Each structure stands twice: as C-alpha cells, then as structure tokens.
Paper text:
TCS are composed of two main players, a sensor protein called histidine kinase (HK) and an effector protein called response regulator (RR). The HK catalytic core is comprised of an ATP-binding domain (CA domain) and a phosphoacceptor domain containing the phosphorylatable His residue (DHp domain). RR activity is controlled by the phosphorylation of a conserved Asp residue located at the N-terminal receiver domain (REC domain). Thus, we have explored the relation between the effect of the pH and His rotamer-dependent phosphorylation from a functional and structural perspective solving the structure of several HK853–RR468 complexes at different pHs.
To confirm if the pH regulates the His260 side-chain conformation in HK853 and, consequently, the pH-gated model for this HK, we solved the crystal structure of the complex HK853–RR468 at pHs 5.5, 6.5, 7.0 and 7.5 (herein HK–RRpHs structures) in the presence of ADP and BeF3− as in HK853–RR4685.0. Crystals at each pH diffracted X-rays at good resolution (~2.0 to 2.85 Å) and all of them contained, in the asymmetric unit, a symmetric dimer of HK853 bound to two molecules of RR468. The overall structure of the complex at each pH was similar to the previous structure of HK853−RR4685.6 and HK853−RR4685.0 complexes, respectively and as expected, ADP and BeF3− were present at the active centers of HK853 and RR468, respectively. A close inspection of His260 in the HK–RRpHs structures showed the presence of the inactive gauche− rotamer, as observed in the low pH HK853−RR4685.0 structure, independently of the pH used for crystallization different from the trans rotamer observed in the HK853−RR4685.6 structure. This observation ruled out a pH-induced mechanism in HK853 to acquire a trans or gauche− rotamer for the phosphorylatable His. To check the correlation between pH and the relative HK–RR disposition we superposed the HK–RRpHs with the phosphatase-non-competent HK853–RR4685.0 and the phosphatase-competent HK853–RR4685.6 structures. This comparison revealed that all the structures, independently of the pH, showed higher similarity with the phosphatase-competent HK853–RR4685.6 than with HK853–RR4685.0 (RMSD values ~0.7 vs. ~2.0 Å for the superposition of ~707 residues, respectively). In the HK–RRpHs structures the DHp helix α1 and CA domains in HK853 adopt an identical conformation to HK853–RR4685.6 and the two molecules of RR468 are also placed close to the DHp domain as in HK853–RR4685.6 structure with no inter-domain rearrangements. Close inspection of the His260 in the HK–RRpHs structures showed that this residue was also interacting with a sulfate ion through its side-chain Nε.
Numbering used by the authors:
A (entry chain A): 246 to 478
B (entry chain C): 2 to 121
C (entry chain B): 247 to 478
D (entry chain D): 2 to 122
Write the structure that this text describes.
C-alpha cells in the first residue's frame, strides 16, 4: 500500500473527478450564457448532462467512501434471501448506457434454471456486479467489431458461481493477483486514458470476503479475462 | 463560415464545444481520436484545430508533431484544450507546435475568446 | 502513515460531497421546475451550480498541486511583483467565503507600498488564499468580531507576511504537526469543518521552493499568527 | 397550510429544499443550527422537521434526542437529510426517533415524495 502508490492514487482521483466537472462546468456556464440560444429540448438535454455527470461523480465518491469504511471495518453487510437471476438483470440494465458509448454489448445466460435464491446483501452484490461489469467495458479492446461483457451464472460447491467474462486487453501474468490490491492499476500502453481509482476490485474482494466468499481471475492477454465470484447458498 | 476541426475522444466535451463554436457561426467537424483527425484533414484544411491530448488509437502530442511534418498543416493554428494540468505538458505542446494550451475544466466564454483571437 | 491516509480518503469524499449535493439538487430542480421557475430564480439556481463547481475544482486542484509537489514536478517561475496588490487581490477573492461565515478581512502594510519581490505570483497568491481560507474556516463558531488580518513587513532582507486571526487557535501538541500532509486537529470545533489536511503541506512546500519558511504561533482559543518569510 | 421546520447549517441546501417544499404549498421555517432549531419551537409547532446531522453549536442527533423528551415534540415526525451515509449513522437517528433518513447528494423529487408520505398518512 506504499507511499508511492498513495501519490499515484491521489492523482487518479483528481483525474477521475476532473472529467465530469469539465462537463458540469462547461454545460452549466453555457446554459447561463446562452438562455437566448438554446431551444427548450437542448436546454433539457444540457441539464440532463449536468445531472448525469453528477451521478458519475457521486458514484465515484461512493467508491472513496465504501473503501474507507472497509478499511476501518465500519461496513457490515446485512444478508437477506434474494433472487440472484433478476438482481443480475437489473445491474446489467444499469450499465447498458456506459456499454453502448464504448460499443460494448452486455449479455446474460444462466447454466442453472432461474430464479436462483441466496442469502446475500442485494445492495452489496449489485455493487460487486457493476464494478466487474464496468471493468468489462472500461478494459474492452479499442477496435469494436464484437466487444462484449457476459455475466454467466452457475451453481457449484453448495454455493452460487457468478462469472463475468470480457474479451478485451486481458491482463499480464505478472499482475493477476495484484489487481485486487488497493490502488493497483496496470500501467500498460492501452491503459492510461482509462481512469480509475484502483479501488473498485479491492472493495469487491472485500464484500465477497465479508460474505464468506472468494474472487479470482484467469486472464489471457489480448483475448480477455474471466472473473469468478463465489458465495454459498 | 469559418471551419474548425474538433479532436477530442469525449462525445460530451465535443458537443458542448461544438455548441459554443456554432454560437459564433463557425462550422464544426469532429474526430474521435488523433488518427481520425488526420484522415479527416484530407477531406478539408481547417482554420482551427481544437486538440485534446489523451485519446486512444493516436495521441494528441503525436498529431501536433505530424502537423509539423506535412506542408499545408504547419501554419493552421491549434488550441490544445486538455485535462493535463501540468506546466510541463503545456511546454511540450507549445514546442511540438500548439499556438495555445487551455486547461480543463474550462470556461466556455474564455475558450471562445481565445478561438476568435486565433481566427482574427 | 497508512492511518492518516484512510481518514484523508474519507475527508476528500466528505469535502467533495457538499458542492455535489448542491449541483445535483439545483440541477434536478431547474430540470423539474422550468414552468415553476421565474427568470431571476433560474439564473440564480444556475449561478449556484457554477459556483459550487468552482469550489469542487479548487478541491481537485488541491489534490493535484499536492501530487505535483509530491513527485517534484512543481517548479516555480519567479517575476518582479507588487506584494501589496497581490494581497488586496487575494482577500478580495475571499470576501464571499468570509461573509458566509461572517469574518472580516483586513490588510495593513507596516512598510509603504508597493512591496516588490522576486516570486511566482500564482503560487504566493495560492499561499495567501490557503492561509486566508483557514482564517475563515477556523474562526470561532459564534462571535461579534471575527477576523483575518494580513500584515506586510520587511525583515531580514526579505519579505514578512503575517496572516493573523482571532479564531479557535491550535494546541501546542499541534504547532509542529499542522504542516504535515493529511494532518488536521480533531476537536469538537473541527468536526464539521471540511478539509483534506493538504492545504498547509502545499503552502509550506511552495514557500520552501522560494527559499523561504513558514512558521506558526497559536494561543488556544484566542487566535493565530502565521508567518511566511521569502527573500528579496 | 403545512408548516415544515427546515434545519441545516448550509444556506445553499436551505434555498433549494425551501424551493421544492414551497412548490407543493408548504410553509418553510429555517434554522442555521440545532440550538436555534430547538429555540424556534417556542414560537410555533411544525408538522414536519427536515433535520441535518452535522451543524455547529448544536448537533442533529442532539435535536432528535430532545424531540423525544418534551411530550409536545414526540408526535411530530422528523425526516433526517444528511451527508452522513454510514448504516451506523442511520440506525442511531432512527433509534433516536427520526422517522426516515435520506442521504446527500439527494433527489429533490424523492425527498418531496417522502415529505408528502409523512404528511398525508
Ligand atoms: N475486466 C478486466 N479486463 C482487463 N483488466 C482489468 C479488468 N478489470 C480490472 N482490470 C485491471 O485491474 C485494475 C484495477 O481494477 P479496479 O480495482 O476495478 O480499478 P480501476 O478499474 O478503477 O482501475 C485496472 O487498472 C485494470 O488494469
Ligand atoms: N488559522 C487557524 N486557526 C486554527 N487552526 C488552524 C488554522 N489554520 C489551520 N489550522 C489547523 O491546521 C490544520 C491543517 O490545515 P490545512 O493543511 O490547511 O488543512 P485543512 O484543509 O484541514 O484546513 C487544520 O485542520 C486546523 O486544525
Ligand atoms: Mg479526452
Ligand atoms: Mg452541515
């Protein structure tokens, strides 16, 4: 977690948050300086940008918050019986937008027939699915003839087996375990204009290990990654 | 009537920059990356390049450089409108061609003042 | 230390959420109330959005300046500058933040103006605003008089800026500790005051790049004097 | 006709909550802190209190606690609208008497939906 990586992380937050502030600032100064020159439906659009770029920020500030709680162990999960099949679906919808913008299609199949029951915190696994799904879009390839993220659902070992498979850049073998460390990001050449905190997977390892579960990854570079989440029944 | 090339990899940024530019009557043509901006330059020579640095495929420092290597691209002004706040980033872009570097987040009114200055 | 790192991460989120709540609230209200908003109210609710983004941008420029100084990218660029205008300018820009907490901001010069110096005016303006901002942020909760006086002088063939306040003051257990990255004093009267703990770690480091030093003096619950010294 | 006792140290927050509440018809009354908030209850009694947690002088958990002690104040429902997002902070406020807890950043339409839901019954 060293002092060097803290410094790179402070920059990364700065960079993550800059982007929507630019939108926010520039959309909002324009509306103010152009009330004469916006038609109604372009007034409403420019505010829809402001509202939507503030959600991105908000999301981003909850990543900082969740992580801080997990550090000090304020976060305790509250388990309840949940249908995982439509939980998954709902999370996939929530990324539909982000996906299309990178021309990433987002799929879902279940090797077990639905609906799959489990004693989980729905809030927290929804968070766990979105981080994996987001990462799936964020770390897509550049060339877009068939880019995807697929969420596969099975039942293994008196438990549930969620898989998130993408087909992007993949991860170098000298890093396949250091992606769950806090602040860790791969410093490749097809990895620097993709912003992130390096906290999203730390959180997700932690939530899955507050549930008594585990996460692992198998990544074949230039081909893609599969991220295995396991929680019991 | 004036013709501006807009070269950022953000739909959002492009759209609001295109909007302020078109408030002044200028005419926008857009590019997702550096590589595409150069492919678009063969269709038309522009009065202005608004150029981002960080984009996939082909970087914005690279475009700036390649605008020095070809003939009708040397004397067309660039304004760099980037998130890269470093004082060392500004120097590089000035010495790699850029006539002006403006930082993000930016003021739409100042940006437009500076676009005008470099067109007039 | 990994201890003060975690609190820092929480403080950034804590300090960036306030302008964001505003942005989100004003932006949804405007979008849901076009028919129920008159013009001077529309322009005002926009002006809030613009204003709270500027608070946000500041707080991101704090993180960025800090990281810059941490990696030693921040080389300063020195020029001949009137420090009297700088300080007027600087307090002018803190008048709104001041009046929101009802702090007055005075400025005297023990030498006559103008006071020339070889400094980066971007960066000392940044030092003045951080010291002024802390003057405003750490003023006493309720009082008839609350203030932040900047004072100019010429000491030791250099310039001596003092930023004096009558706010909450600092315990001696934290007269050495206030300048270190991430450090904040955590009392009942700093609970709900936002901040990263970076502001003075930056100001110390900007000042030290000029070949100068900053020290502090504080009487717990009565006020503080911050001394910046830069050469000629 | 429905008085609502808005209580938050941020003047900005006040403006925009007061705006959304006045859209529905409600009659806002504003308080910079918990002390003041409690101090204005002599004046009148509200149908709703929109309560911040972190304020100076007096805290928001302290306002809630006192709300349960005096018998005229127990029956009036409190919504808490706070930047305190911990689950631990919600449970304390609920156990201190708050009827709902809404986080910040908030949606003005949900907050309103919920402000109605308390008043309508
Ligand atoms: N699906 C994926 N494919 C390839 N690389 C990935 C994937 N998911 C995560 N990574 C790598 O793991 C690193 C850390 O991921 P995460 O902790 O979510 O932080 P962030 O996405 O904010 O960088 C990323 O920088 C990226 O290099
Ligand atoms: N003028 C002042 N009066 C009293 N205390 C102060 C003053 N200025 C700074 N401090 C203390 O020094 C700490 C660090 O200051 P700074 O680095 O600017 O960070 P912050 O963003 O927390 O203000 C503050 O948290 C506060 O406790
Ligand atoms: Mg870009
Ligand atoms: Mg508050």
């Amino acid at each position: 977690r060293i002092d060097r990586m803290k410094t790179e992380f402070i920059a990364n937050i700065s960079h993550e948050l800059r982007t929507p502030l630019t939108a926010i600032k520039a959309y909002a100064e324009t509306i103010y300086n152009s009330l004469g020159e916006l038609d109604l439906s372009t007034l409403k659009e420019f505010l829809e940008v402001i509202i939507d770029q503030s959600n991105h920020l908000e999301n981003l500030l909850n990543e900082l918050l969740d992580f801080s709680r997990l550090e000090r162990k304020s976060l305790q999960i509250n388990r309840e019986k949940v249908d995982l099949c439509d939980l998954v679906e709902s999370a996939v919808n929530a990324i539909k937008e982000f996906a299309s913008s990178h021309n990433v299609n987002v799929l879902f199949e279940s090797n077990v027939p639905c609906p799959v029951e489990a004693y989980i915190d729905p809030t927290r696994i929804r968070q766990v699915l979105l981080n994996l799904l987001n990462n799936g879009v964020k770390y897509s390839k550049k060339d877009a003839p068939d880019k995807y993220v697929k969420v596969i659902l099975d039942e293994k070992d008196g438990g549930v087996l969620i898989i998130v498979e993408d087909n992007g850049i993949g991860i170098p073998d000298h890093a396949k375990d250091r992606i769950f460390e806090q602040f860790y990001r791969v410093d490749s050449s097809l990895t620097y204009e993709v912003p992130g905190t390096g906290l999203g997977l730390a959180i997700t390892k932690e939530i899955v290990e507050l549930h008594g579960g585990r996460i692992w990854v198998e990544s074949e570079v230039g081909k893609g990654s599969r991220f295995f989440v396991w929680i019991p029944k | 009537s004036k013709k501006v090339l807009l070269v950022d990899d953000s739909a959002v940024l492009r759209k609001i920059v295109s909007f302020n530019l078109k408030k002044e009557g200028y005419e926008v043509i857009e590019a997702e990356n550096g590589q595409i901006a150069l492919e678009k330059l063969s269709e038309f020579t522009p009065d202005l390049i608004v150029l981002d640095i960080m984009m996939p495929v082909m970087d914005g420092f690279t475009v700036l450089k390649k605008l020095q290597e070809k003939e009708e691209w040397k004397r067309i002004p660039v304004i760099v409108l980037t998130a890269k706040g470093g004082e060392e980033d500004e120097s590089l872009a000035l010495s790699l061609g850029a006539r002006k570097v403006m930082r993000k987040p930016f003021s739409p009114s100042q940006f437009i003042e500076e676009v005008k200055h470099l067109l007039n």
